[PDB]
Symmetry: T
């Protein structure tokens, strides 16, 4: 049976590479999903990739990953990283390890992004490598 790895994207990440692309970058959330589905072939794992602007959806998906005995979750909660006690509790309640991922380095941004409810509950964090943040997360998650 093939280990399944949830990759869960929070709000606004669906907008990646749309605002003035010849200024803020060309790469989109689908492009990253395509990269990752291929990396998952190289790594011999299936990868279930989802996005929602809803805090509740990320929790449902964390709980769904435990129900399905998933090997790992790679979680980019986006802005909910800094507000969601509920996502912190979800990660702590489930036995499936969670890896926090950010494209940008949140500590290099606004002070309100220094706070990570995900990071307080997760196994680990990879930040600041753009799409490479996901690819590193998926390698580490395969070797768990």
């Amino acid at each position: 049976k093939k280990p399944t790895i949830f990759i869960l994207n929070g709000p606004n990440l669906n907008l990646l590479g749309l605002r003035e692309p010849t200024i803020y970058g060309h790469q989109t959330l689908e492009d990253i999903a395509n990269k990752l589905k291929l990396q998952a072939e190289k790594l011999d794992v299936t990868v279930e990739i989802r996005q929602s602007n809803h805090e509740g959806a990320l929790i449902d998906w964390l709980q769904e990953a435990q129900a399905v005995k998933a090997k790992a979750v790679i979680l980019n909660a986006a802005a909910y990283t800094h507000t969601s006690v509920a996502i912190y509790d979800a990660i702590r309640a489930i036995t499936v390890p969670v890896i926090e991922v950010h494209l940008s380095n949140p500590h290099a941004r606004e002070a309100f992004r220094h706070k990570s409810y995900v990071g307080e509950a997760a196994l680990g964090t990879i930040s600041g490598f753009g799409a490479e943040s996901y690819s590193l997360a998926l390698d580490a998650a395969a070797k768990l």
Copy 2:
């Protein structure tokens, strides 16, 4: 004739008694629903019992209870208790009394759980008796 009492459970409470039961406890959210439906027979009230990982669902349900002239709401908002100005506003907007319930004693935990937006708007609070927190809430709610 029969008074209806909403009993609303927030995120992660659906996971009660699942993770390593012979370590973190056997009793489940359904077991508590079954206890409560029986207590509701002894008390001559119907009891509408619901759970969601979605903050918006608890608000919809608070508003639904006012529309239906419900006698009371027993609310365990779980993690949203500590973040939701929106749930605080919903409780204050509606005329139906709200009783805050927690299985655990939140004041005995992490400092971030000392804050209760629910408690700031509710009639009252029962904490720390596990399932008995709900049973006490339902007695008090019947005598309102």
Copy 3:
């Protein structure tokens, strides 16, 4: 096409005028929608008016306004104004101008309502004029 302007209402605003009208003030969210649809005829713009108790819905709608090349968004996030980093990021990610609206003056209320994640990301803010807050927002939004 007449320019389209999204008008997005957050949680509990659907309860406007219902609770004890002879105390909290008669006028309802529909009444305001009706005022606005008529103002929109005088101004030669179409107006898409929505309400949800769900933080995620407001973000979906902000993103949907950019996808549809809407001219403006008038946003009353209600309690989520004070909690939502995710709405702040949605406003910043989209190119459509956002006008913050409040019926009441939030600075005249509880200290926790002094914080506006919407206001930190929006073009501008109109507060405290009840329904006239929306009408002013719609005039300003038409002239953008």
Copy 4:
């Protein structure tokens, strides 16, 4: 032998129902003691009910309850709830379970009352039901 349950009232609760009774309510601390002594007959437990304006008295009484192998303490520390590290330590030092009780909902009042040294050490808390807060506490305490 009959289980004994201490019920300990802190400062100013002795003044309950005296200031302008036909405005702020008729019921007194004795009336509640009388209610509770009768409930204690129904429940087959003896109940030792005390009040003092002295922080030290509540600690002496907590320690006296352990010495006498009391089944439980119901504690309304009143204002000392928000200041007394010493009462927090007393509860934690003794093996007798403590139930926090408040007539009012302290979270609905001044921010300085949100802090509960009792709540940080107690098994549980019942708040906001007036005299019913004690009666619920005594039921829960009997079933311990």
Copy 5:
């Protein structure tokens, strides 16, 4: 003789469009005064427009507006918005409604500008529309 509307500008607004105009913008405080005097003709109100770098002058003018039974004050206290308890008290002491105005969106700027002593006492606030902030304020003020 018509309703009179005071429009009071605090410190540094007199410098609008002067420093490097082909960089920080061409429009001046006089230009806005001229716009507003014309709008006031369309609206059938007299408009008394004043500027001072002195906190005391804005208070004298608020008090003068009450003495003269003005219909409204439009107040852009500029930096004093964030420091002046005295202007907060002046607004609260007088019966004449005050509308807060800002050219810029202060919530989009330095955290020290998030604080508004004016906004805490005023009827309402219009921010972020440049000169349009005043025009909106004057329309709302006429319909009061």
Copy 6:
């Protein structure tokens, strides 16, 4: 009956004048009691003067003043002024007016003495005039 005025002194005021008088200032708590008893003759009021190092004693005495329909309480809670929520509640619960008194000006001292739980509940405050603080309090208290 001559109106009776309680004058209540908190901890350490009993040490006034004892420690190195030729440095800390000669006058003792008895000397002040003697001054006050004489002033009370000139004013036609009886004066009941007490001191305790016990927070609980000051509360008992506040409550005793209401029971005896005393005209006023002059209260120097000394260090308990900065810690006692329970004294704040006692003052608020009783109908007898309380005047706060300090020998020294506490705002001129350590930041922790800037907080006055007494001052937050009392009618009024006289600070910084040594014994004259009491004498002024007794004149004001007689005229109440």
Copy 7:
């Protein structure tokens, strides 16, 4: 020629008893000036009574009092009490004792009024007796 005592009133006190008098009280700032001029005859002192909405005026007047070898200043800085480091420095720089006066008890009001730059530098403070606050201040000031 007699001891001269400056009595300096800060912003908004000029509005005392004007706004809806049959609601917020009938007595005015002139009435208090008249009371005080008469008390000054009984006490054998000249009294110079002034009011300004300008922080700078209160400083000029404090400095003028030192230049004229005044016996004392009675200062009600009103809102500037809570903001003015400059008035704190003026009091500290001059040799003339300053008595802080408030009509209301500021500790009984909004938390921002708990802060007193005047009180941190003054000899003493009388608060909460309305006009009696000034009369007490003038007696204490005469006996200095």
Copy 8:
């Protein structure tokens, strides 16, 4: 001839070695008193050893030690160490040196125990050596 040294124990220390001794330790407060009386023989000093759950008792005892020209006080105020401005004032008012003692290292515990009103006023502090904390204190106190 013999120097007397007060040794004053605050709340809950009377409970030392009682709760489940074969888990939380065997040694009691009396055992430490017995150790100390013997050490006092070797050191040629009389030792007055007392305990109370009452803040006021520790103050009375500090004041009593000054009145009796005691050489030193060894003070373990327990929880009152973190709350008592009154004990801080008592230590500062008296000329008798005070040595702060703790069995445990309070800096190694909860952040609220990092604050020591005793330590802010005392000569010195010995923490974390259990009973040896007292023995060291008594040696240092004898050589003063």
Copy 9:
């Protein structure tokens, strides 16, 4: 006609060397003005030296310096340094460089003087050299 350099002194500096000179120092603000006018001859610049207790005057003068194309402003805002957002904005709005000057080292004083709204906007700061602080400022200002 030469480069002109404004030197602006805020509140209370006019009192330098007056209060008990044989205690707090003999040198006055005029003495420093005389020093500086002579230094200005050596440096080939005109120097306009002003003092006011009014925050508004310092702003008027900063704006006047820009209008007159002054080379530089040397600003000792005294207490307004720690409160004036308005002076911060004036410095930022004008093109003329501002040098902050203090006689004393404010970082060596009360924590409230650590905050410098002037310093946050100025080119540079010279503190702690008494009159030498001005002389250094004028040399640096001439070589700009």
Copy 10:
């Protein structure tokens, strides 16, 4: 030809796997250096691996890496991560990218470890994978 990558370890990491190994883990800092030297062969890069308890050493090494045109630095500043403004400045001053590494997840520990001066200046961060944190860092660093 060969890119050189500095790997810099701060204080106490030299102690990895020493204290009671059959309890707190077997693997040592050398073991990780050996893993990394081998990975560096597979990756075609030389790897300069160093440790110091001295903040100044990590700065010297950051500066040395720029001077030597190193491709990247992998930095585990250990405790200095939470205190060193100087290391933050060193990373910002140099052009060589820095990757922050932690064995443990610092967000899962004491609140003081949530602060990362390294993270505020670095390209990116890998936390919580033990030795795998370094291996991931070295892959990412090779592909830069």
Copy 11:
């Protein structure tokens, strides 16, 4: 074999008794080393006494003490006590017990000295006895 006890002195302690000795005290760091070497003869232990202005040196020495199976460390980190997370980690990593020592009582000084990273990790603390602080530490350390 003789137990060895490290005694480690942080920055500026090397300057003890040099600044105006006939004012701030005659005794030097060597004098204390000489006292302690003699006490160590009485106690049958060898004592290795060191000082550095370098944070890193104290850590190296803590680690060196574990490597050498030292019985104890007596640590006066001086100013690094209030800043050094790295020294806190060093103490916690090593098995050798650490006793915190201060000549002065840090709680009696500036609020920034109330914080002790050493105290948070150490067995215990002796403060405020000058050189006697070391001698007490060495007795306690011998009896470990």
Copy 12:
């Protein structure tokens, strides 16, 4: 002997001018040393100029300046200015006057640079004039 003046540079100042000079500003730390050595000839003083990335080195050098009876220290502690209690204590312990120097205006930067442990202990501060900050410091230092 010519009076000797230590000029001490902290971490990262050694990188001045190196990184992208055509952006960060051409001038190097050597260039400034050369300027200063020449100024020192004009002033008849010798100048001992040093730099280290080590906090401990700056303290050693402060202490070395006192040992050598240096006339003054000019200190640019760079990032350690904002962290070093130990440098604050070194300045306070030595009798040699210290002048704080910064190239940039730290108050114009990140809030964490507003804190100056050097400034809290130093005679005086010169900030924001680049190399001219040192030159002004050396003139002031010669005249001491």
